[PDB]
């Protein structure tokens, strides 16, 4: 069914961000429900959301590393890097905005995982 993709999509993608800043990723880690508890490190991919699909096809993607895929374009992204040594609330994130290339898992023809290690650094 639809719902990986869903998943995906709640995670990882907010279209249309104001901000990109710590008080941008304290909300948006908490309406995307990854804050009961804490999530330590997570990304969201701004911007069009079919491009974002197509990584799963040849126009935007390419096979990577161990069966990933890496997109062809560059995304604008935050990172939202959980602060301090507690897993339970509250939640102080740190933002980190970029232009990345990004990493996803398919099933289907859609992204259904994103390989969020590679947003640990910088």
Known sequence: ???RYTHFLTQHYDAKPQGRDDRYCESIMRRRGLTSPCKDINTFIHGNKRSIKAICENKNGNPHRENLRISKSSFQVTTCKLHGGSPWPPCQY????????????????????????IFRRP
């Open 94 to 117: 740190r933002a980190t905005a970029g232009i990345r290339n990004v990493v996803v898992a398919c099933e289907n023809g859609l992204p259904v995982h994103l390989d969020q290690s």
């Open 1 to 3: 069914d639809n719902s």
